RNA sequence: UUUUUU
RNA sequence: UUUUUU
């Protein structure tokens, strides 16, 4: 009896990256193409995106794509992943095509299939598989969860979510909850869902209210408004954009990828300026009250807008106190130095500074434990896969389910690159595949690996010395130095002392070129480490 | 023209970390606290943070003695560093704080520092112009003061770190000397000076009788092995878990050489008195999981200490499994958010049970929240507020809540360090600045790390480095050597080289001076690797030959 | 909101 | 919990 194998290869035991294969017989769907931010112990570089060694080999039984929604966790890693495949079928709502399109032509990559699809259609891959898009809200328009109707049975993912009652722009977007019950009445074998705040208790606030406060707020600032919240949120936006028009004030939109995401959402519908955008200049004829700044920077990025007014470097506008700076965001793990760093820069120009928990200002975009219990609850799965979360989102959201009049049979906690077999009753880890990360640093895909991270990490803890050797005409050493120490005449004579004497044991005996480098190499080390108690990187060098 | 009192904050204003403060009233100084900082993220490689005393130094001899408000190290890290580059002066502090000042100086070797030991209601006097009263505040370690700087222009209150913890559990009647305080705002409070870190926190801290209470549902509850994490030096803490240890039939065994220390000093000075003997690990053993309760350092996510080892799996005697219960008794403080989350999931890929908050109320913060510094405000009555203790948010904030309180301060100032905050009866204002700031320490080495240095280091951790060499015999040729920069691919070797290389055979073709050529290599290189890569590698070019 | 140091 | 891009 052939089962599914749901082999995830990205976004399970982390939060980001997310790629999801499904596989029966010799037919592939695959699910998202997301990359992931860099951590701190990965300097230097710009995203990851997922080894894609398994559907390479597989290539030829790809039968589709379907994609959830455009974040970037989920459609960032596309460019890379789309140019080593064959050109198939990609499904998608209206704003993630858009997107998706637009970062397809960056890359110049050419005769991509995408294919609009909308909520309720379904969607045939090969002989065993069918898709079946429902809406979920979300912090991103578009946002959609799907069922894939296969031999063994239905599984439903619900694609990264949240329950909100009412997202506040009155386009009366809800979540199909409706669909969803009826999938639990049909049958669901297995539930794939989002793990993101099964920590946290409760049920994630709606953007209405999040609007309520925010206009609550806005109505009570004597002079300039600027916020910053992330540029994708369309949502958030938009109801800013509503409750300025009442407030009396004009909207600048700041920051490029504001604009971005601003044109992606206008040209798709969900976006809806009441009163034209200004520029700067333009609002500068008015008076302060009348002004509101929607701008990039909510995690603290120095380069961004926000970021540039805290720091004075803004060419066009410099904050004042009098000014209302919100920070309508919370920093996500990782962030909070780059974010506090902001604060504090605002609180020393004397703005009055908005900020959670302090203010309401901000509600995820992912469902809290009574949110994820709604959904356990309806869909009664068999098997249970909590996903998008790592090891300590996806066990607590293990354990939530077990609180329930209904648990799954079981449950599992995939790992990236599991191969986890699914049948009538079955439901296992069955093997593993090639899975992983690759980075992208610049231009370059995968030319900084692990190795070179580890020398980065080296260098910038202990800093650098370059000693250039010369046993012509007589033996001597030379030195060049980064972030070892400041200048030190004392220091600097010892150490050429330190790797001469050490050629000198070599110069007397006779010396190989290879063999003189290790000894006066321990010479510096020995003593190097003897007088200031610091292991610095040296490289060794012979003219 | 009146003399007035200049207080001159070096350290710890506008920040949390290496605290100390200078007090100033003609030619005599009394200094408060000598603490460390630790470094920032972008402060890569070194170790700690000590204050800049350039003013101190200038001003040696009118220096009287100095006050130890209590043993954290932001309070008296500083002081091997300070001290050895000082006069010899009365150093006044209570037991604990003296305790553990003490073995930091026996460490440094530093000889002949005249500490002296005080208590609660101590009144100890420096030079003609200053008397200091000692009171008692709670705080997250024992021996932990206030005072009050009676000087000729008028009485300053500092309430020290604290929060107002109505019982910390362990039976020994600590509690806030808030009669003082209260006292202190009916004779007369002209400044206060407090605790800004919890300031934008409302409502009330929790208590650590009411953690304890938490801990102990929490263990009795556990089937299998306890481990535990918490600062060291949360001796009241540590203490009560002590205690519910024994009620609910587990040894204890205190793990890492931090916890070691401070379990020393604290039994030393009376402040942990153990209701059954430590056991080692290898003594627990011989008994059942649910028999055993190990106190571990680590609850900031040091991966070298226990617990870090032991969620890495590297631990040499002890191995984690499932069934095992895992408690981080502490919150990560600002900074150390990833290197905790590291080890929780490390934690749950072991399959430990883990244990934190704010699931589980396992820990209360050692400083007070809105309610307190109201409290504190209200019983001080405050002529003048210098919030303290938090950087410009948390002063800010500080400031704010005494405004909504029944009797404002006459003036809040927001002070910096190296301000000179000058102080009379109706006098309060910022009068000039003194040299302040910080000095790195890295390795055996104080100062001789810069932010000159460290710039260099982010340059190299973000890019890595590229060191080209141009070689002019016989026929010229560059040379190419990479760290950190990427993984080994020749062809881009050889384009670098070719893009060198046209740089120095032009360059010699037009005369320049072999200054000018290096700068011409390296800007070429910047060129053609920014095209062929996007990235900038940090670069650094030699002609010689 | 203070260290940690097989 | 997703980007920013004087
Ligand atoms: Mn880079
Ligand atoms: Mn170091
Ligand atoms: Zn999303
Ligand atoms: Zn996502
Ligand atoms: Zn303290
Ligand atoms: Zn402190």
Redesign the interface.
């Given at each position: 009896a052939p089962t599914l194998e749901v082999i995830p290869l990205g976004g399970m035991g982390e939060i980001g990256k997310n790629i999801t294969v499904f596989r029966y017989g010799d037919e592939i769907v695959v699910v998202d193409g997301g990359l992931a931010f860099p951590?701190?112990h990965q300097?230097?570089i710009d995203l990851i995106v997922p080894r894609i060694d398994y559907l390479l080999e597989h290539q030829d039984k790809i039968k589709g794509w379907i994609l959830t929604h455009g974040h970037e966790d989920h459609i960032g890693g596309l460019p890379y992943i789309f140019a080593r495949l064959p050109r198939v079928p990609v499904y998608g709502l209206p704003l993630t095509l858009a997107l998706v399109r637009e970062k397809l032509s960056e890359f110049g990559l050419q005769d991509v299939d995408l294919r609009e699809v909308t909520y309720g259609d379904e969607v045939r891959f090969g002989q065993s598989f069918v898709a079946e898009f429902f809406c979920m809200t979300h912090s991103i328009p578009d946002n959609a969860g799907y069922i894939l109707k296969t031999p063994v049975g239905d599984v439903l993912h619900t694609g990264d979510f949240k329950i909100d009652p009412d997202v506040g722009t009155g386009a009366g977007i809800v979540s199909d909850l409706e669909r969803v019950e009826q999938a639990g009445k049909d049958g669901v074998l297995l539930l794939i869902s989002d793990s993101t705040n099964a920590?946290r208790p409760g049920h994630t606030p709606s953007e209405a209210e999040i609007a309520r406060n925010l206009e609550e707020i806005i109505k009570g600032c004597r002079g300039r408004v600027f916020l910053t919240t992330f540029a994708s949120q369309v949502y958030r936006i938009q109801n800013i954009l509503d409750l300025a028009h009442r407030q009396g004030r004009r909207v600048v939109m700041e920051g490029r990828s504001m604009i971005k995401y601003a044109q992606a959402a206008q040209a798709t519908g969900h976006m809806n300026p009441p009163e034209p955008f200004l520029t700067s200049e333009e609002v500068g004829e008015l008076q302060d009250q009348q002004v509101l700044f929607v701008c990039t920077g909510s995690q603290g990025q120095p380069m961004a807008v926000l970021g540039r007014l805290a720091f004075g470097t803004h060419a066009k506008i410099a904050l004042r106190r009098g000014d209302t700076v919100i920070l309508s965001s919370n920093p996500i793990?990782?962030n909070?130095?780059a974010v506090?760093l902001i604060?504090?820069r605002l609180?020393?120009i004397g703005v009055d500074?908005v900020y959670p928990p302090?203010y309401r200002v901000h509600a995820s975009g992912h469902a809290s434990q009574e949110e994820l219990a709604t959904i356990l609850n309806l869909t009664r799965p068999k098997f249970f896969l909590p996903w998008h979360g790592?090891?300590?989102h996806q066990?607590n959201h293990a354990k939530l389910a077990q609180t329930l009049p209904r648990p799954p049979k079981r449950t599992l906690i995939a790992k990236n690159g599991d191969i986890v077999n699914l049948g009538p009753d079955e439901f296992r880890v069955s093997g593993t595949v090639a899975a992983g990360a690759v980075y992208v640093?610049?231009?370059?895909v995968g030319?900084?690996?692990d190795?070179?991270?580890?020398?980065?990490?080296?260098?910038?803890?202990?800093?650098?010395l370059?000693l250039?050797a010369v046993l012509h005409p007589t033996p001597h050493v030379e030195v060049?130095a980064?972030?070892?120490?400041?200048p030190?005449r004392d220091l600097e004579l010892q150490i050429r002392r330190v790797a001469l004497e050490a050629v000198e044991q070599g110069l007397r005996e006779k010396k190989r070129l290879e063999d003189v480098r290790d000894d006066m190499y321990g010479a510096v080390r020995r003593f190097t480490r003897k007088?200031?108690?610091?292991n610095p990187?040296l490289?060794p060098?012979i003219?």
């Open positions: 951590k701190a300097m230097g920590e793990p990782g909070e130095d506090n604060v504090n609180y020393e500074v302090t790592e090891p300590r066990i640093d610049g231009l370059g030319d900084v690996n190795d070179v991270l580890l020398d980065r990490v080296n260098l910038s803890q202990e800093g650098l370059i250039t060049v980064r972030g070892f120490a400041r030190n007088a200031t108690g610091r990187v490289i060098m003219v």
